[PDB]
Amino acid sequence: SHVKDILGLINAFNEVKKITVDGTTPITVAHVAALARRHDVKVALEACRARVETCSSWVQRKAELQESLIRCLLAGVFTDELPATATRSAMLLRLNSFTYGCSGIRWEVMEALEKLLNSNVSPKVPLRGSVSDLIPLAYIAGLLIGKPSVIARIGDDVEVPAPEALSRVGLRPFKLQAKEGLALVNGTSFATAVASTVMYDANVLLLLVETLCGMFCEVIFGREEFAHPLIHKVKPHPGQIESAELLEWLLRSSPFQELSREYYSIDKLKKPKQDRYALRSSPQWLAPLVQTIRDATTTVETEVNSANDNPIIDHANDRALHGANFQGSAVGFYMDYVRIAVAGLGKLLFAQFTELMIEYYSNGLPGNLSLGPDLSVDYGLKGLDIAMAAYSSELQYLANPVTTHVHSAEQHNQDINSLALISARKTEEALDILKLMIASHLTAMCQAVDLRQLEEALVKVVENVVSTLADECGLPNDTKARLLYVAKAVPVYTYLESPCDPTLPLLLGLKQSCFDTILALHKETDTLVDRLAEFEKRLSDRLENEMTAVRVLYEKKVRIQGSKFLPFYRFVREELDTGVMSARREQTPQEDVQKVFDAIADGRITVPLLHCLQGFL
Amino acid sequence: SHVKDILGLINAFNEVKKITVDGTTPITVAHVAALARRHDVKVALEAEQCRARVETCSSWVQRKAEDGADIYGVTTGFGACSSSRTNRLSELQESLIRCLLAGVFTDELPATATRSAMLLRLNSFTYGCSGIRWEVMEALEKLLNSNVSPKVPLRGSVSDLIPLAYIAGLLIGKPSVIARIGDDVEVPAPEALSRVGLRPFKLQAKEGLALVNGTSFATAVASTVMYDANVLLLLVETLCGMFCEVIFGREEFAHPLIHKVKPHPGQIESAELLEWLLRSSPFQELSREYYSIDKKPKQDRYALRSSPQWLAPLVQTIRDATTTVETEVNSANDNPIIDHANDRALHGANFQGSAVGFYMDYVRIAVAGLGKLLFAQFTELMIEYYSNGLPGNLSLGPDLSVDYGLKGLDIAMAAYSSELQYLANPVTTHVHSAEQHNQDINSLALISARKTEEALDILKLMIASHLTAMCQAVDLRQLEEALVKVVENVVSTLADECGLPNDTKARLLYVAKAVPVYTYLESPCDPTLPLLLGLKQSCFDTILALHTLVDRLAEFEKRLSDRLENEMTAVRVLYERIQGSKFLPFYRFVREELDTGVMSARREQTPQEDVQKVFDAIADGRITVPLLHCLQGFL
Amino acid sequence: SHVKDILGLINAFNEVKKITVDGTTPITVAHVAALARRHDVKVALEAEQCRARVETCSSWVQRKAEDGADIYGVTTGFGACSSSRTNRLSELQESLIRCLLAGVFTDELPATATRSAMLLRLNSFTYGCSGIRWEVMEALEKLLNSNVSPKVPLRGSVSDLIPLAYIAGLLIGKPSVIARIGDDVEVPAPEALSRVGLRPFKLQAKEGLALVNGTSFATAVASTVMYDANVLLLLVETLCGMFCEVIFGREEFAHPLIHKVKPHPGQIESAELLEWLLRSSPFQELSREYYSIDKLKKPKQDRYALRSSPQWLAPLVQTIRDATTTVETEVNSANDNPIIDHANDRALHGANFQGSAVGFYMDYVRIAVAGLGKLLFAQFTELMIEYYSNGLPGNLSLGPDLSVDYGLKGLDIAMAAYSSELQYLANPVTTHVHSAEQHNQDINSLALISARKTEEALDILKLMIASHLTAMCQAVDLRQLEEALVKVVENVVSTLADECGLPNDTKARLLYVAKAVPVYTYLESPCDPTLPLLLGLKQSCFDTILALHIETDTLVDRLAEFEKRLSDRLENEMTAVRVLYEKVRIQGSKFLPFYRFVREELDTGVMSARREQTPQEDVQKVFDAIADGRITVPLLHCLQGFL
């Protein structure tokens, strides 16, 4: 299952301390992401050396030209630049490409790459210029030869010219031998580097979205039968089976699905038989998105673990082979595909968020998830709801392909070019938006949990008050049974604003049943009306206070405790320090969502994710 | 002519000292750009012309709210919650702000955009339809002139509730809102107001909604976008004339009658400029001389010959969109519209930025169109088969093995164009049914303006590279004329020294004139290269025609391999027609003001270093000086 | 106002009998559309006007060619081969046509587009810059007036060498070129020429190039596209008011001051039209009465699809009007090369064959069309959903049995399908420029391709307009039935209250419920004790027992009887007026011409289980009427008197 594969990627990202760089052991997108984001992770180039040196001296024995190429390719402009995370990742990938002994590069130059990587040194690289990565890679090479015009970063602040940057880590500017200049610039390092970090994030966020569908089911009062194994066995898309298998496991023995079943047993013929598509159709929706992301990871990693340069030196057969391994078409096209899948993940989220905001589609929940009770000065998550539309709309825009804009380039020599870095940049941008949408969604579902648990508590109060007041006013058993049904049946949030308001749903149902009990018991009539009138007075004096106290008690601080999404709720509420959103909470929606987004951005969200999925398969 | 209009915008941007905000005087995209980019420009809110109508509308809203008139967003809930009613006039407004402070810092909206949005919101208020207090307007003026603006999240607007809520958040002194003071000071909102001598406002009726219910951010970005569009448009138009001069084009393409007979306003006006720029050109003199020898293509390729037709829809789109954006700038984008004169609140949708949104989609396509023209012209310039004498990659050499010239820049131009064309896909097609399906149509104008801005960034790169290449081409053309004269001299003097006939002399002088110098500059006396080939062909031709002559010819060929190459180097080393050209301001600007020279293996400056200087000049606006100089006298 | 200009275009499209091509009087998109769609419209080439300058130009080029003057296309090779020279005048022009006959038949360019392109090439020649012979122009006139046109492949142009080569191949009688004569007969080109009394032409100097070097096909499709764009835009603008009437909207959204204060020319003009259409509207009377009952429980403002329509329409109106001018400039231009200036003895080398103006504007129009589609889809969505309907039933299902009636749900799904594809089509074509023809055409417009896609976009918009108008005619009937149904419930409740001997307190309370409760929420089973009518009645009855708690025990008896006797009379009388309706406020509405046209001229009625006609059959009729221009009659009648 792809789920266990992604869990492996997350574990690899966390547990790795050193990355073994030789021509045999596969570097994954998790490894690339680890090197880029965790500076304690080091590059270990293990001597492989036999092949490199054979190739290196073969090229030299067989034969200023190289440094003229670098000068030529240093043609970028600073407007925006490629992040140090992408550059160092590109440096890792260029280094790994040399380990196959096909490039003719010196081993000493490879050691320098390792030395610069482990010392947080990377050149400043302009964002644009590559049709896929001559211009960007020329800046790594420019650093290695000590071009004063080439500025290098050491850490997060220090910016010094290339010669100074080399000297601070005990290195001397290289004089380029034969083919070395070309071997440094020919390659797919930058495109595949961004694609690597893109694919790691795509894998984590995909699993996150998959998992959170179950949490949506819990809070929206969904029917879990949508994930039933037979439905998906009979339409057996690998991603349709595996997503539903996850959801089935997440929703089995769920205390919220207990409440859901109870909800649809009351006025069954007045409530929807099926859920809407955002939930019910999610396994079918996720299916292609799962497969696109999984298959693209394989493609990107194949590129990471390849000799991408030209010519391919075949020193064993005394031959130099002329081809086009510098062509990043594999990454470029798949980056387009992933961006469309990411946009599809965004649409799923947007659709679910929309259902959650609207009282007509939320099965009991209040509009905009406003707690109120005063809805006139509490508009809840409306701002976030608007933002979700803005997020999705830009996301769908971005998912237009880049590979369709191939220009005949470089004196019509490069009449097909991949544009791989451009596309990967756009997929990265798309995932940034997706991170925002997931943050907003998880914040909304945590709010919905609070609202559901308070709903159960409030209905219990109403039931108790109406039960005891029926006794105290000496109402008949027929009357008591009618009024207690209304207490259970009517949605609490439809009247929470003013529980005893005559025009709001609680008293309407009460007045209706009161008329029905007078007609049914018209067999003492006068005393019945006396006792029913007293019921209304007692309710108008006691009920509000009883409901308010419970709400205030709940806000001062249980169904989630037995739910598999408890880790997510605990993480957002306790570890991040948040609470039910209301007019009495001084924190802005920004402040609550920012906390969640930052936890998604820096990978902390994987702790409750793994905790949630512990025991699965 | 649009050319006059664009020059007017450039002058206005440079010369404006104070932006008058009186609710009568139109604010142009040049005024918006001036405020955003020049800190010395100040906002002058005039009480004389609009204070009266502001306080009338302010009083009206407040009195109607206290009486309990059923007006949206003052006594009712917001958006899809418009069925709810309230008498809590102050809390209703600040609950809307709490709600809309819902952005996430991931990236930010620039200070320039935020400040432009503040100017545009203030301008909306001057019309006296908003019901905002005059004191709030004075605070916006005070914050603008004191360089105070909130940090705003980039995304959230479907068009500009969320981004405007941060301007509102500053005004009411929210702790969570961070504000800038200049460039290096960032403090919470309550402290920011304290430093400029302001108290946090207590929102009165409608004031919250009045602050957030505008198109300020979408129109802000669009204003700077449209100013830059006009500037960069005229820049591309003009530089088509420089391309003609260096590529050896035929200025006949700009002939009045061609475009008179296909009368697209943008086509006529672009051709008019180009005809004027090329009328007394010294390079066009070299062009006519070039095509007189061995009369070579009869017509230029489309990148030049078709420029007036190509620019036509691009000129019109940019000109029309400038009007639409300025109309939005000078409008009350707010709801409800308070009609105090007739005692009623009017419910509409002036908050809808669809006019900006849809036109931002059109301009991005036009900017892409301009980029394709630049890429096409650049492509021609880099290829010897299409450059009519110039060397490939514009490599000076002479040693081409260690000089690949502008190949790096040529590659970059493809990457620029490719991403540019991608960006020009529409945003207005991705409308989602938003905000509890209340906003089932929404403009997405800010998002679109942001993308058009990104397109213009890329276009700036392309113009910078194009101008650099063409300055390289100028030097290469002038050096070509000087090299040919040297070769012509050497051949002429050596023919006399060897005592060659008049038939022989004429044939060898013709070859020296006809053969493109950059084909044999790498090794002038190489027997396999074009000069010696044509010489050897003429040497056999003269023998047959006149049939010790062999001895005199053999001496000529031998003396050439000892005298020619050294004299060609001499004139080249010295160098390491534009004076009569109308593009002298640009060449003089790039070479002298930016301190650059002929690109070669002997010039140690990287293409990055040289093109960076040109880009910076385009970005900060210094490039308008050589542009205005170049266009002096055009009416 | 753009409204007047569009009305003028429709009038000219209807009234014109002859298109005069004289090189001085402009041809509008209406004339191009008229020639293509109305076959009684004939072309009148005026020799008196322009044949002098044509023959002057014709004899100039021919005399220069025989001398051996160096001019492109007449003595020089084409495109990137402009270094090859020749004195073989006849063959040079034949060889160009030979290599340009390179299209493939998979689909084809319709006769409407081809004949329009023929007209536009003919018109281009009248300016006397091409060097074509007058007799060739005469032949173009005769071929048009005889309904003879070549079968042209759909694709091949980057903008229109290949498609125009089939018009030229027809003129020289190429056997491979197939020509159609009217709707039925397809014959080879030389056989088609003899049937109209023409002999195959032999191309002289520049003639082969003059026939192929135009923007005729791109501008042809763009002309009929822009005519359709203007007609359909006004139709969409108009039907926003009909939407207001049926959705129970506040006409306030179109108040002149709102739009004066935000003066986008399209915003003011669209609101101006809407204000006029809704002034003293009978449906707006009902709307005001609707929001007066339980005012503080209903929305203060309409949703965006109506309220924001003038703001939405603004850039859409400006785009469509601006592109009409651009297209008409191209229609009335000499799009050829070289441009022969016989006066000053010069052949001017330019690029008037570049359809970039039409290309870029087709992209903009498609985006505007997509925007028009989204507005319609948004309005349609609100109409289908009862929470946003202001009383109308879900899917506009009449019922009353909603279990066997799902109303216009099928159309609702289709509307989304239409809009989805429409938004996809509005991506630009101009951004996909390849360096073409041996890198000679490193910029090219792609105008014909772009125009083809905007045309496809317009076809979808018609589907949407057809569905939108049909739904609103359904809504009209539902509103008028609703009004009549509320009258019934009121009278029944009123009379029964008296007959049961209920107090005036009770009678007034129960009558309020009869008015306040939306009738479509309980029409399925009025007397159902769980549906909103009896809910409100049970509420009011109990409050009466409380308020009057004079006799009290007999009150319960009379109230119990009221409920019981409501089951005996109410359903029968509600059913009666419904069946009576299936076998008034629209009569005073300005949208009456649209309702009459759909209902009686096209022969339709209320959609229910009792109506045998499918949604397809009803919408088809409306679509056909929009397609063939019959929709302009109820449009012009509706707008009679405006401004």
Short mmCIF file of all heavy atoms in Angstrom, two decimals, chain C residues 21 43 67 86 101 165 202 242 320 437 470 478 490 510 602 626 630:
data_model
loop_
_atom_site.label_atom_id
_atom_site.label_comp_id
_atom_site.label_asym_id
_atom_site.label_seq_id
_atom_site.Cartn_x
_atom_site.Cartn_y
_atom_site.Cartn_z
N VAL C 21 -19.95 46.46 -52.46
CA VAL C 21 -18.50 46.48 -52.33
C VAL C 21 -17.90 47.45 -53.35
O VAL C 21 -17.85 47.16 -54.55
CB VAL C 21 -17.87 45.07 -52.44
CG1 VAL C 21 -18.12 44.28 -51.16
CG2 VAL C 21 -18.41 44.30 -53.63
N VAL C 43 -24.22 40.12 -53.61
CA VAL C 43 -23.06 41.00 -53.66
C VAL C 43 -23.17 41.90 -54.89
O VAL C 43 -23.43 41.41 -55.99
CB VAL C 43 -21.73 40.21 -53.71
CG1 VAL C 43 -20.54 41.15 -53.71
CG2 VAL C 43 -21.63 39.25 -52.53
N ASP C 67 9.04 43.77 -67.79
CA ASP C 67 10.30 44.51 -67.83
C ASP C 67 11.38 43.81 -66.99
O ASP C 67 12.55 43.81 -67.35
CB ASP C 67 10.08 45.95 -67.33
CG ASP C 67 11.38 46.74 -67.22
OD1 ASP C 67 12.20 46.69 -68.16
OD2 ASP C 67 11.57 47.42 -66.19
N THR C 86 13.13 35.08 -60.96
CA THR C 86 12.64 34.46 -62.20
C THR C 86 11.87 35.44 -63.09
O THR C 86 11.37 36.47 -62.62
CB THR C 86 11.77 33.21 -61.93
OG1 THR C 86 11.38 32.60 -63.16
CG2 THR C 86 10.52 33.56 -61.11
N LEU C 101 -1.93 23.99 -51.73
CA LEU C 101 -3.01 23.01 -51.66
C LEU C 101 -2.50 21.81 -50.87
O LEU C 101 -2.17 20.76 -51.44
CB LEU C 101 -3.50 22.61 -53.06
CG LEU C 101 -4.29 23.65 -53.88
CD1 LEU C 101 -4.43 23.21 -55.32
CD2 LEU C 101 -5.66 23.93 -53.27
N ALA C 165 -6.03 29.18 -50.74
CA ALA C 165 -5.53 28.50 -51.94
C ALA C 165 -6.61 27.67 -52.63
O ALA C 165 -6.51 27.36 -53.82
CB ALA C 165 -4.33 27.63 -51.60
N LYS C 202 -6.11 32.06 -66.06
CA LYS C 202 -4.68 31.83 -66.08
C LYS C 202 -4.01 32.97 -65.32
O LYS C 202 -4.08 34.13 -65.75
CB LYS C 202 -4.15 31.71 -67.51
CG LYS C 202 -2.85 30.93 -67.60
CD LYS C 202 -2.38 30.76 -69.04
CE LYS C 202 -1.32 29.68 -69.17
NZ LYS C 202 -0.11 29.96 -68.35
N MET C 242 -35.13 39.62 -16.41
CA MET C 242 -36.11 38.55 -16.30
C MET C 242 -35.77 37.66 -15.11
O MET C 242 -36.66 37.18 -14.41
CB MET C 242 -36.20 37.72 -17.59
CG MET C 242 -37.45 36.86 -17.67
SD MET C 242 -37.61 35.88 -19.18
CE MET C 242 -39.08 34.92 -18.80
N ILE C 320 -16.51 43.05 -26.15
CA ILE C 320 -17.28 42.66 -27.34
C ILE C 320 -17.47 43.82 -28.31
O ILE C 320 -17.42 43.64 -29.53
CB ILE C 320 -18.63 42.02 -26.94
CG1 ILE C 320 -18.40 40.61 -26.37
CG2 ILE C 320 -19.59 41.96 -28.13
CD1 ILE C 320 -19.61 39.99 -25.71
N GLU C 437 7.57 28.23 -41.06
CA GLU C 437 8.01 28.48 -42.43
C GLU C 437 9.49 28.84 -42.47
O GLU C 437 9.85 30.01 -42.61
CB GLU C 437 7.18 29.60 -43.06
CG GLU C 437 7.12 29.55 -44.58
CD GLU C 437 7.68 30.79 -45.23
OE1 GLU C 437 7.37 31.91 -44.75
OE2 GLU C 437 8.43 30.66 -46.22
N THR C 470 -35.52 29.02 -20.79
CA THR C 470 -36.51 27.98 -20.55
C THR C 470 -36.83 27.85 -19.06
O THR C 470 -38.00 27.73 -18.67
CB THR C 470 -36.06 26.62 -21.13
OG1 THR C 470 -35.80 26.76 -22.53
CG2 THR C 470 -37.12 25.54 -20.93
N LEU C 478 -44.48 29.21 -12.28
CA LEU C 478 -44.45 28.82 -10.87
C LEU C 478 -44.77 29.98 -9.93
O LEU C 478 -45.40 29.78 -8.89
CB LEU C 478 -43.11 28.19 -10.49
CG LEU C 478 -42.77 26.81 -11.07
CD1 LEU C 478 -41.28 26.56 -10.95
CD2 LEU C 478 -43.58 25.70 -10.41
N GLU C 490 -55.60 31.17 1.65
CA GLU C 490 -56.13 32.28 2.45
C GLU C 490 -57.65 32.24 2.57
O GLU C 490 -58.18 32.33 3.67
CB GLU C 490 -55.67 33.63 1.89
CG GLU C 490 -54.22 33.97 2.20
CD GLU C 490 -53.82 35.34 1.70
OE1 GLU C 490 -54.13 35.69 0.53
OE2 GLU C 490 -53.17 36.08 2.47
N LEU C 510 -54.10 32.82 12.00
CA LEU C 510 -54.10 31.75 11.01
C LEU C 510 -53.98 32.27 9.58
O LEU C 510 -53.38 31.61 8.72
CB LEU C 510 -55.36 30.89 11.14
CG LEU C 510 -55.62 30.18 12.48
CD1 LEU C 510 -57.06 29.70 12.56
CD2 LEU C 510 -54.64 29.03 12.72
N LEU C 602 -43.63 28.78 -29.88
CA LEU C 602 -42.85 27.60 -29.95
C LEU C 602 -43.61 26.42 -29.42
O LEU C 602 -43.16 25.30 -29.50
CB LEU C 602 -41.58 27.76 -29.16
CG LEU C 602 -40.54 28.75 -29.62
CD1 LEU C 602 -39.42 28.84 -28.62
CD2 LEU C 602 -40.03 28.37 -30.98
N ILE C 626 -32.69 30.72 -31.21
CA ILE C 626 -31.50 31.53 -30.94
C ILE C 626 -30.48 31.37 -32.07
O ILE C 626 -29.88 32.35 -32.52
CB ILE C 626 -30.88 31.19 -29.56
CG1 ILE C 626 -31.82 31.62 -28.43
CG2 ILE C 626 -29.53 31.88 -29.38
CD1 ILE C 626 -31.55 30.95 -27.10
N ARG C 630 -34.36 33.99 -34.84
CA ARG C 630 -35.77 34.23 -34.52
C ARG C 630 -35.96 34.88 -33.14
O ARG C 630 -36.97 35.53 -32.88
CB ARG C 630 -36.59 32.94 -34.62
CG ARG C 630 -37.31 32.77 -35.95
CD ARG C 630 -37.44 31.32 -36.39
NE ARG C 630 -38.22 30.49 -35.46
CZ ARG C 630 -37.79 29.36 -34.90
NH1 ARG C 630 -36.58 28.89 -35.16
NH2 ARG C 630 -38.59 28.69 -34.08
#
